[PDB]
């Protein structure tokens, strides 16, 4: 825990949660995302979202933790939330290695 001051961490830790919730509310509110689950769907109307608290929360940890997770975002909103998120995670780890070296 030494190579990064014990201030970013508490900034970091809540940051994962912070993006996690704003992910949830937007994900639950989407025009593009409600889809039908049946493998060969004959134009039924059984569509719903796939984003919940645990599902979005875990992606927040997983994306930061640099092991890929599921819930490939589909809408421009949910995708752009992941797109910006990955950048923050990508630099911090790369920051983490560089300083520790």
């Amino acid at each position: 825990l030494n190579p990064l001051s014990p201030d970013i961490w508490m900034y970091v830790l809540l940051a994962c949660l912070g993006v996690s919730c704003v992910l949830f509310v937007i994900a639950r509110f989407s025009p593009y995302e409600w889809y039908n689950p049946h493998p060969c769907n004959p134009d039924s109307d059984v569509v719903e979202n796939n984003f919940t608290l645990l599902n979005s929360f875990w992606f927040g940890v997983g994306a930061l933790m640099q092991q890929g997770s599921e819930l490939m975002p589909k809408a421009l909103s949910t995708r752009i939330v992941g797109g910006i998120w990955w950048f923050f995670t990508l630099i911090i780890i790369s920051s983490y290695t560089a300083n520790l070296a």
Binding site: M10, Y11, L17, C21, F24, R28, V47, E48, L53
Partner: peptide
């Protein structure tokens, strides 16, 4: 004000989580 702003973010997440459970129980397949 890192602690203060972090508490504000905690407030945001708390209010959402309180609203999250009802939106867990509300929708189903159609």
């Amino acid at each position: 004000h890192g602690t203060i702003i972090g508490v504000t973010s905690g407030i945001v997440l708390v209010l959402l989580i309180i609203s999250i459970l009802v939106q867990v129980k509300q929708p189903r397949k159609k």
